[PDB]
Amino acid sequence: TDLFDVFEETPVEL
Amino acid sequence: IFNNAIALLPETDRELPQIKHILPLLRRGIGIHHSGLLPILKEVIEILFQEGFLKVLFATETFSIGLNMPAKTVVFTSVRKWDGQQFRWVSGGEYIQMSGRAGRRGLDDRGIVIMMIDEKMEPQVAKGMVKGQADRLDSAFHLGYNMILNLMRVEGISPEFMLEHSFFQFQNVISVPVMEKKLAELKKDF
Amino acid sequence: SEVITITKRNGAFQNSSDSQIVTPGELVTDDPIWMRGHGTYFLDNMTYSSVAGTVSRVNRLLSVIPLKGRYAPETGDHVVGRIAEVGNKRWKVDIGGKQHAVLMLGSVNLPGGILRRKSESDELQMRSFLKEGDLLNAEVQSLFQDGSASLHTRSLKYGKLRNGMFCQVPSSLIVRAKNHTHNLPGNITVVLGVNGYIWLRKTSQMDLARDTSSWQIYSDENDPSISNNIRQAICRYANVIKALAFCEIGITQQRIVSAYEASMVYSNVGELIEKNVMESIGSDILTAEKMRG
Amino acid sequence: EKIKPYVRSFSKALDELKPEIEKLTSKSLDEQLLLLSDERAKLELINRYAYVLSSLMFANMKVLGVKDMSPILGELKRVKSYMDKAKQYDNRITKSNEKSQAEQEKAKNIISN
């Protein structure tokens, strides 16, 4: 859970 | 007179080898010009060139700039010349600067320009070399850190101020009011 | 509503960030690899300080910066000179430092400029353009073999003062910046020397020219039009200098503005001399230093 | 309808973080450093100010909807790389102190032995 991985996830997309 | 040139050296220095070698050529009415000689050698030749004892000069680009030592006859042995990047066909105002050194004002009737070539050159190039063009003069401004020092050290002005009046952006000066005029047109037609 | 501060204390002569703090006679080290500069003397290893000051280790250079001493002259600095003497074609002039600066005869702005060229009759008129004790703006050129340096006025901006008042401070509290002439609301101008010498005067057009005749460069004249509202506003900026000087405050141009608006409590300008109130306003700004930046 | 939850939701997160910003820039980049003495205490303050801003400029650039996001993404692993370094440096400061205190306890036990 390194703190730059939130840049990397795909969001919750409709 | 030559020994009087060697008179201002030590007697140990009066026997230095390179000058022993060149002196019979220098005795033969013959001179060579380039940087690699001694400065004391560089001055004595041009004197004797200026006093015409040495009918011959084997020269490079300093004596092209080195004036007040006129010629009658100029020989172009290598047409092309290395420019740091390429043994290139010499451009115009180079050759024009490399032209006029022959022909004494009150004395010589003409100027004698003789170029040895070793290629059937393209016609406009020998034009573009000899029927030449005055070469464009533009700023080669760059930066250097000792300049960067003292403009901080002297208080009154700035290094930025230098750039506001540097000719290197005069490129960025000239064509823009035309485009402003085009903009003054385009702000109307809109 | 007073005349004098008379507070009494009888029966006594007197009321009675880490770095190396070294003394004279003291060893620093004996690593031979270090270089030996100012504040340092030695015997082949023994690194010996000579003052009360701080060890400065610069990357292989060890040197001792003191805490106490006169002003150190350096080139390119903007200071204020008081005219000491006149020499052959030379002048002597106090910096406040160790010695006088020198000032060549042709080192100055001539009236009419360079079209006025040289003349040997100019040394027959040294006293014409300059005389003793006078104050001016000067530009530190270069030095001698000792550490004594010289001056000049290579601008219109440098020149003989008028239109105001002098004050002086310790050289320490004056902070270095890329600028030294400062213009303050109240239509007035501080000319902070580096050396500890401070001139106030009214803002000129040349001062106004900085942010948008020539024959008056040795005059003892002022602008004749000087209001008291100019003059009394001078004194309010005057005391707050000594307030920060008594409070040991590095001078910020804004702090002065901050000193000035904090001084708007007191319209009685003569009350700007109080040991406590200067310290109070001194205490104000340091608390006000703990908000902004 | 479809936009109606998320836009008010995200703005509330802006509304959530909006006081946090003002407390973050309460005192200046000089002040919040110049009040501090330890360079380690100076350290992450430089980073964390950039750390948010990096995300901030990555956030607002989405609002233009520009298809490129690389020349802030190119800045992203940079800020990581400097955050990568001093942590590993500060790991080594531990081993400087972690084992030196065992040197303290050992040599006292040697005379005890």
Add this chain to the structure above:
Amino acid sequence: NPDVLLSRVINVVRAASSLASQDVDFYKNLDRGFSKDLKSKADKLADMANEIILSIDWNNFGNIMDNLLEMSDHSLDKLNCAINSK
């Protein structure tokens, strides 16, 4: 404090990641006022990014990130002399 306010940043980072995930142009079609609210929510961003512009005060942005990371570097080199010489 780092672990508090960045956790709130992470909170808004994911929310920033939650923003343009949906198709946003469709209600920009269906009204300007969706887009204008999205413009107005960007006016927060026109203010909230400006807070650190205010801390200083794209090609503007390309400048200062150097000068931010300027000051990062002179730490560790001083930390090198603070530690490796130590």
Add this chain to the structure above:
Amino acid sequence: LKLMKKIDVLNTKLSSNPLTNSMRLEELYGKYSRKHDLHEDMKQLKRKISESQAVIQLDDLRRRKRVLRRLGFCTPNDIIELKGRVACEISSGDELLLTELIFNGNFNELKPEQAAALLSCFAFQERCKEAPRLKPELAEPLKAMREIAAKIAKIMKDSKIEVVEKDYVESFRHELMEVVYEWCRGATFTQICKMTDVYEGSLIRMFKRLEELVKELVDVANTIGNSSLKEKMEAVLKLIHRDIVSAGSLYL
């Protein structure tokens, strides 16, 4: 299927809009569009002109503002340090290096014959034949100064200053050091002529360059107080400024 819904507004709303094509709105579109193109292309041009404004050299300069701060020659408030005060009387060589060498103080155990060969590593530019790997008390300081400039050029590489660190090193030329080491030992001009192809005035063209160096080096310990250095500096200057170095001209 949900993708087509973007058109399934346009299927509705375009037909719904008042004067979809009434009042020659199709033509009035091109009436708007000929305005709208003029709306586009001026500022398109005006971006170019606004792009055609500034000093383009600042990006070089802004990188160099980094450099001295990285070197500590000035504050971030740009106030010049004593470090940067050093090379104010240095123009004759790499000022970026020559401060650091003296700030790395490596000349404390260099002799006047020894450090002069290190000053041959500056006063001359044009490449030539390989010198041998010389006596290492030259070469190890030569190895020492090479170690310094890399870290310098490292941060120059970090500065977005496009300089090949490798090519930055071979900007330094280290070959005449032996001949420099022997003219320090009182060698004959005749003898040292044998040790190169490089012509004799060109030697003097760096010799009389080298005096300009060493004289500007004398400036430095005055500004620092390295009293050992000032003893060592003119000790060099004694040992170069001599017989053939005393050349003067004839016109003057």
Add this chain to the structure above:
Amino acid sequence: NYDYTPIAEHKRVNEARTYPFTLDPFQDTAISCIDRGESVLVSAHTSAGKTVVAEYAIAQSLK
């Protein structure tokens, strides 16, 4: 807004350096610019006599 009068009209009141022979028309045009007191580029070849224009301004500085 500068107040201009033609330099081709500039009757030089004095040869601040006199010269033995007939000077050239551009050299005539040159020295008036010195004499009227404005700066000037002249760009010629070295054999032309750009030297001669430099000879003039010395004395006008010296006088």
Add this chain to the structure above:
Amino acid sequence: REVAWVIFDEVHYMRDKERGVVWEETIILLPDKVRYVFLSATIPNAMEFAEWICKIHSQPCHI
């Protein structure tokens, strides 16, 4: 401070990629009172120089 005339010869070395920085900057560092001379080889684009100078030291310059 007693110089009003400068004779610049060899002006075209401003296009020296080696040293031409010096000629350019030193002219920028001139006080604007001073008169100047400029001599160099023939260039076609001489006026550009005058067009550059005449602003930045704010006095006329002939060609």
